[PDB]
Amino acid sequence: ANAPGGSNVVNETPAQTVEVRAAPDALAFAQTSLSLPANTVVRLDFVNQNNLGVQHNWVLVNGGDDVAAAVNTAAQNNADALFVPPPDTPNALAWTAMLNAGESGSVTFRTPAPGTYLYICTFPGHYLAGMKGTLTVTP
């Protein structure tokens, strides 16, 4: 049940790939901002190498802090799948699986219309702790 997902996930060749890494000594993403073209197939590679032994995932949400909380809350109630957003979670565009320290996982999805979007980690307490970043989708 611990698997990638999201409304925008697709099985197509990526036009672009981008790597995101976890901060090694903090509950954060090493990259707090991303930039991608709209309605483009992209493969996001999340590399979770950290010195805390902690799990992390990468979750792109259809909106901001308020939408992020709903997704994160839906995730909080999904321990059986290692706290990834449940499938068909509203406003969850794309997510990687929940990764142990030392693990790497990807998600391939079509970027949404141009706009600003938060990406967060839904493992319990990380989002509140500030593990998030902003995705800007251009024309």
User: Where do contacts with Cu ion occur on this chain (CB under 5 A)?
Assistant: 56, 121, 123, 126, 131
44 is in an annotated binding site: no
* Shortest distance, position 111 Cβ to Cu ion, whole Å: 22
**Cα–Cα distance measured from residue 29 to residue 130, given in angstroms and rounded to the nearest whole number:** 9
* Shortest distance, position 42 Cβ to Cu ion, whole Å: 21
**Cα–Cα distance measured from residue 126 to residue 133, given in angstroms and rounded to the nearest whole number:** 12
Cβ proximity of 127 and 68 under 8 Å: yes
Q: What is the torsional sign of CA 61, 67, 71, 72?
A: positive
Q: Which is nearer to Cu ion, 49 or 138 (CB)?
A: 49
* Shortest distance, position 22 Cβ to Cu ion, whole Å: 7
56 is in an annotated binding site: yes
* Binding-site residues for Cu cation: 56, 121, 126, 131
